[PDB]
Every structure is written in structure tokens, then in C-alpha cells.
Design a protein around this ligand. Structure first.
Ligand SMILES: Cc1ncc(COP(=O)(O)O)c(/C=C/C(=O)C(=O)O)c1O
Ligand SMILES: Cc1ncc(COP(=O)(O)O)c(/C=C\C(=O)C(=O)O)c1O
Ligand SMILES: [Cl-]
Ligand code: NA
Ligand code: NA
Lengths: 427, 427
């Protein structure tokens, strides 16, 4: 009858009194960790004083203006316009309509197709599911909607062949050039991608990938959109994934990580180029002014202020990031059936493989991931299996102690993994 | 630059010290009226104690179970399964995917087309905007996606011709039969409609309309979906619009009215037929179990408990509804350029017309509505203009006094309207 009692820092406690390490930070979003009583209070205060604004007033609710001011301080230059939503899924959907509307305004109404990636995830809307490349969303029949295409994911371990990462990076990106040319540049609105594919299994692209993607977008006059749903609000040590990989998207989407998951909220950050365009069109002015649930906005403000003023983000870049990465590699590198050990900031992962030498994957990709995950679970550690990949994204406020503590349990579980593997003769 | 200070009951106050009557209850959703400090407290408590649950636990957060249990008590028979979202727009989107998935499971994957209405509104997603029939989101571009069709709205004043309401009702509904037959019954997944079209201008369908719609859906094995975004949580005096019009939809969608707008939340209520179907498919099990932001769920619980236990809904049926309707008609019936005075419960409206005898509308439908609205606004009353329709949906806790007070100001504004009409020679 196991029931969650409470959560604190990086831990969750059950009814039987057991403590669970949340190596996933809820749904990749509990960035400041659990237990932030101060957030409850910011909520209480805002609900009490002014939980609504009205379009009667022709102004913006002060708790939204506040959030916007602070966001502009932590986001790259030129991201002045922000459109608030209730979720990452809505952010994606809004982004889609914004991209299409932008081209309309430009007198290029046939520029409508957005390109995404297989094993990409952009939420659960029809719009987002059709943009995302999860294989079990696309055979559905209705997905994808037209104006959606997909290229293969830059996953080196499977698609690298004999190429080096850097080399594969150029190839993997060039798939965007192929798809654009195949479709017609005059029909393509945008490429959308997570800097690191989260739900795809923390597929980290080679260093050559993103600058090539961007060159291609610019070449063919296609907008570039980063989906910062998972990589946003300090996850890679930078404020946003795209900053780490060193590309400048024309828009980017954010989700409940903006509030550490405390209340539902998302946003679309819009750059100068597109902002100017949407304003002339006027379609979205209402959202840029009146968007943002005030209570949610106040909790988001608290969370971002914590992220900055408590040096949580800088700490990922400087201290806990490098440490986690080093320790992550140290801990996991040595296993027989564990390969492509990878990570940046506080997102990290590895893949379970049949044989590292041949770079051979297990059959029925995901069944072996399940087996490993059940173990982490029976051992009161939360790490998720995406197919045969194992992924972790703990709260950003995790300590060096907590790091070692988590890895300790993971270590033990993987030892147990190899055994059960041999014990079954699947090793 | 007027700034909203606070809100209380049905009133909002500005920085200049003026009091404004909110005849619209925010965005049709502030059902229990402003100032509910008890909601702040339910929020504060939930955020403090347990603002998250984890899928590790294989149970449902208690604040969600609670909400579900209470909802089941107030919703019609057979609406056991509920899927929570953050918004009305998401609810619509989820509903669409549910409908399509249901038919897949049934071995009928080509049953994909949903039918909506012109001047219908089902939110702002791509999915919802393509289902809705606002022609200002329905031109040359992305919308609509395939698997979306539209029939004309049952708007008597324009489409009635020489028929009586009840007569027109049968015709207007039969448009669904025409569209189905035109498309092929084997390709049609569902008909979706707001019991009363809200943002379309509170178009109230004849009494014959909905039972006919349902007969047609059942005839052709097409699902029937009510969009209770605006009509839900007591607006028509009943719990849900469809109860008032006497049809039983297989699913219905709900929005922030579930929480009186205090925190973002929505839901899809799923009937036995479809629930059974989606469970066999298993696609949606995760949401039926783990869906619902707990903080939002706790605020929603408070709001529903208030709606019931404080007899706010009953009060709309018995007391304030009849009164408002009577007084609404009394007040507005007598004007030269005001016709189709209409309403049920606490939703009510009228249309500005050039000449009532010919049933002739003003040209550039909406310009005249703008002029009237500016007046309500310059007089510190909130009522919205949808084209040339004028609509009101004040909080449900409005008193007889507040009713008369609102109508008083509206009266004056309409007197002023007629004059400015003559003064321009547009009368
Ligand atoms: C890449 C990516 N883009 C968009 C969304 C949509 O945000 P929501 O509206 O909060 O669902 C998700 C969400 C899914 C998870 O959070 C998860 O993977 O657990 C996502 O991963
Ligand atoms: C009929 C109808 N169906 C669905 C939605 C979507 O809910 P949200 O996720 O809250 O946007 C809306 C929303 C818009 C308004 O309420 C408004 O027009 O003020 C709606 O009117
Ligand atoms: Cl595979
Ligand atoms: Na901790
Ligand atoms: Na029920």
C-alpha cells in the first residue's frame, strides 16, 4: 500500500518510512529540489491579493511583469518577447502556430512544414506528437498532421558506422539539408529540436552537429527552434541547452521547469527576428500582453530568483556538474554491458548493450532497460529507462554527498544487473 | 494607466478607486466570484505538504483521488474515468486523440473525422482551432488539419428563415446528417459542440436541436462530445450544459471553471462506452492514474465543494437564474435595435440589429458591437461583444441587487447607444 509521505531536497519518503532518491527530479523539472515552503507562501500571497487580472485594464498583472523582467535577465540577448502557457505541450503548439504565422506575415504562406527528428519528443498535443518522432505515436495513423517531417536522430552509437563523432555530426545534420531539398525550401518553416533529446534517452549530439544544423537553417531561410523543455533552467549547467551547444534559435519553448514543477506553466521565448514579424501581424499581441496565470507566474518568479540568486545554476556549471560527470563516468564506465556513458551539467545517461566491441544492442530494445529499471526501483532509486538507455536528471541542488550516495546504489544495482544477466544467459 | 487593485464577489477595483462590475466572471470561469481566501489556504497547505506525486508509487496522489470522488458525485452517471489537463485547450486536444484512439481499438482506424460548427470555439491549440469554426482561424494556411469538418451553427436569427425555432432546430441538426452522409459514416469519429456556443455569442440552440443531433450520432455510430468549457460547473443552472439540453455525450471537456480560474486545470470526463474502449487499448491508462497537478487538484476540490455545499449551483437553477433571465428580458426587450434577447441560468445575451422587423443585421458585423462595448467599458461595466452580439456570464454568486445594478448601467449605455446611432445616422 506504499504511499508517498513527503519530499525534501532530492529525496522522497514513503509510508513504510523508506527514503527514495529521485534521480529524475519528478518529470525532469524539479530543478530546485523538493520542500520549498517559500513557494507555497508566494502562492498563498498571490492567490490572496490578486489571483486574476482582466483585459479590461489594458495593463499586465505585476506578478507577470516581474517574471518577464527577471527572465529577460537570465535569457540570451534578443529574447524580449515571452508568451506564457500552462505547459510544455502548449508551448510547442503555440510555437508551431507562431512559426507558421510568421511566414504568412512575410508573404510566404506556403512555408508551413516543420521538421523534427525520430525519437524526438515535443509533448502530447496533436501538434507536438506529430512533430516528435516517437515511433509509437506515428504508426497511430492520424499523426502526423501535414506540414510535419522527420529526419533521423544524431545517435552515434547506432548510426555512426565507422565515422568519428565529429564526422558523424556533419552527416547527421546534413540529413536536414536532404529533407529540406527533398521537400522544397520554400515549403519549410522551421527545424525544431531538443538540444539533447530527453525522452529519447539523453542522446547527446556530437559537437559538430548543432553549428551545422544552424548553418543549414540559415542557408535555406528556415527558422531554428530549440525545445528547452528538459534542457531549460540550468539542466546542462548553462541556463538553456542551446547555450551549451552554442547555437542561437529564433524561438525556444519552456515548460514546468520554469517553476520547478510546483505549479503548471510554460513559455515561448521569441527572438528579435520573429517577434518583429508577429507584432506586424498582430495575431499574438494579446498573449504577449495578457498571457500568464498570475499565481503560477509568482511561483515561477520565486523559482528563477532561487535558481540565480542562490547560485544554483552557476553551481551546475562550476561545481556539481563537472563532479557528477566525472563521478558518473568513473562509476559506470567499467561495466561489461554498459556503453556510450555520457552527460553534461546534471543530465547524464548510458546505454545497455549486448557487446561493446561490435557496438551491438540487445534485441527488443527496451526489455533489457525494463529489467535494469526494476532493479533501481526495488532498491529505492529513481532513474528512468528509455528503451535500453538509462537516464538521470536529479534536482540541481544535489550535493557531492548525494551524488556519491546515488551512484553507490546505482553501482550495486548494476552489479546485480550483470549477475541476473548471466543467471539468465542473456549476458 | 488604470491598474487593478483587487477583486471581491462580482466587483473589481482600480487604482483610481473606481469599482467595476465583472459581468463576464473573468473568462467565463470565475464561478464562485472573487476573493475566496479559503482557496489560497487549500493551495498553501497542498504546496507545503505534498505538491508532487511520483509514478514510482503506482498510486494516485490523495488530493487527486479526492477531486475525482467529489466530481463523480456531481457528474451524471457513467462518467467514472477522468483525465486531468492544465486547460480547456489541452482537454479538447486530449479528447480528439481519445476519440481517434477509441476507433483504432474498435478496428475502425478510418473513423477519424470530427465534425464541429462554424462560429464554434474549442480552444487555441491547432487541434481545437481546426475543430472550432471561427473563420479568423480558418483561412488559407494550416487550419483546418484533415479529419476536421464543419456544419453551420443553429443560429435562428440568421438561418431560421420562416421556420419556427423548434422547426429550424430539426433542420439545423440535420446538417449533421448531411455532412456525415457527404463524408461517409465510416470516416466520421465524432460530433463536438458547446451546449450553447459561448465565444460565438451565446447562440442558444432551439429545444429540438440537441435530441436530434444525438439521434443522428447514434444512427451513424458517431461519438457525441459536449464542450463544457463555458457551460460547465453550474453556468446554465445545471451542473453541465448538456444536462440542461437533455443529451448524453460519450465524453465532455472542462476548463478552469473547474477551479473558478484560481489555478489552471481542465479535464476530460469519459463515459463507460469509450472508457472501456481506451482501457483495452491501454494508451491513456497513465493519465487516468497519474494525471492531475496536486496543487491545482486541491484548489479544484475546494471550488467544487463550494459550488455544491454552499448551494451555488442549486441557487442558479432555483433563484438567481430565473430572476436574471426575467430581468434580462425585461430590461433589454424594449430597445429598437436590440433583438434575439436570450439566456438560461447565468449565461445570457442579445444581438444588435439594424431593423428588428426584417431581422436585418448591421453591415461589417462587429463594428457596431465594438461601439456598444466601448460604452459599457467607459461606464465601468464588463460585458463582451462577439461581433454584434452582446454577452454576459457574471459569477454565479451574483445577488438580485447586483443583477439590477448591472442591468441599470447596461440600460443607460444602450440609451446612449441609440442616440449615438441616430447622431451618426446609422440608426
Ligand atoms: C521534450 C519535451 N517537450 C515537450 C514536453 C511537453 O511538456 P508538458 O506539457 O509538461 O507535458 C515534454 C514533456 C514530457 C516530459 O516531461 C517527460 O518526458 O517526462 C517533453 O519531454
Ligand atoms: C468554448 C471554449 N472551449 C475551449 C476553450 C479552451 O480553454 P482554455 O485552455 O482556458 O483556453 C475556450 C477558451 C477560451 C475562452 O474561455 C474565452 O474565449 O474567453 C473556450 O471558450
Ligand atoms: Cl532500436
Ligand atoms: Na537532499
Ligand atoms: Na458520476
Amino acid at each position: 500500500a506504499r504511499v508517498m509521505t513527503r519530499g525534501e531536497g532530492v529525496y522522497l519518503w514513503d509510508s513504510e518510512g523508506n527514503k527514495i532518491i529521485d534521480g529524475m527530479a519528478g518529470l525532469w523539472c524539479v530543478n530546485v529540489g523538493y520542500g520549498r515552503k517559500d513557494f507555497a507562501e508566494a502562492a498563498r500571497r498571490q492567490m490572496e491579493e490578486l489571483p486574476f487580472y482582466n483585459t479590461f485594464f489594458k495593463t499586465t498583472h505585476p506578478a507577470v511583469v516581474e517574471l518577464s523582467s527577471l527572465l529577460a535577465e537570465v535569457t540570451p540577448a534578443g529574447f524580449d518577447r515571452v508568451f506564457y502557457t500552462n505547459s510544455g505541450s502548449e508551448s510547442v503548439d503555440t510555437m508551431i502556430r507562431m512559426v507558421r504565422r510568421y511566414w504568412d506575415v512575410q508573404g510566404k504562406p506556403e512555408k508551413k512544414t516543420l521538421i523534427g527528428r525520430w525519437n524526438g519528443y515535443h509533448g502530447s498535443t496533436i501538434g507536438g506528437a506529430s512533430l516528435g518522432g516517437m515511433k509509437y505515436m506515428h504508426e497511430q495513423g492520424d499523426l502526423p498532421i501535414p506540414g510535419m517531417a522527420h529526419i533521423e536522430q544524431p545517435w552515434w552509437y547506432k548510426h555512426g558506422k565507422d565515422m568519428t563523432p565529429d564526422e558523424f555530426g556533419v552527416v547527421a545534420a546534413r540529413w536536414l539539408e536532404e529533407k529540406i531539398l527533398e521537400i522544397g525550401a520554400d515549403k519549410v518553416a522551421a527545424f525544431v529540436g531538443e538540444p539533447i533529446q530527453g525522452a529519447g534517452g539523453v542522446i547527446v549530439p556530437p559537437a559538430t552537429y548543432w553549428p551545422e544544423i544552424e548553418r543549414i537553417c540559415r542557408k535555406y531561410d528556415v527558422l531554428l527552434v530549440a525545445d528547452e523543455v528538459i534542457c531549460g533552467f540550468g539542466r546542462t549547467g548553462e541556463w538553456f541547452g542551446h547555450q551549451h551547444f552554442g547555437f542561437q534559435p529564433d524561438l525556444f519553448t519552456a515548460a514546468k521547469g520554469l517553476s520547478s514543477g510546483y505549479l503548471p506553466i510554460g513559455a515561448v521565448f521569441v527572438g528579435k527576428r520573429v517577434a518583429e514579424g508577429l507584432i506586424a501581424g498582430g495575431d499574438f499581441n494579446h498573449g504577449f500582453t495578457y498571457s500568464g496565470h498570475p499565481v503560477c507566474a509568482a511561483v515561477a518568479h520565486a523559482n528563477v530568483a532561487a535558481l540565480r540568486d542562490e547560485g544554483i545554476v552557476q553551481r551546475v556549471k562550476d561545481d556539481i556538474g563537472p563532479y557528477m560527470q566525472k563521478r558518473w563516468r568513473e562509476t559506470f564506465s567499467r561495466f561489461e554491458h554498459v556503453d556510450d556513458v555520457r552527460g553534461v551539467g546534471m543530465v547524464q545517461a548510458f546505454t545497455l548493450v549486448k557487446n561493446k566491441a561490435k557496438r551491438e544492442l540487445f534485441p527488443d530494445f527496451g526489455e533489457i532497460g525494463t529489467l535494469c529499471r526494476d532493479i533501481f526501483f526495488r532498491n529505492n532509486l529513481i532513474m528512468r529507462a528509455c528503451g535500453d538507455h538509462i537516464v538521470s536528471a536529479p534536482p540541481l541542488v544535489m550535493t557531492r554527498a548525494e551524488v556519491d550516495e546515488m551512484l553507490a546504489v546505482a553501482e550495486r544495482c548494476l552489479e546485480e544487473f550483470e549477475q541476473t544477466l548471466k543467471a539468465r544467459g542473456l549476458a
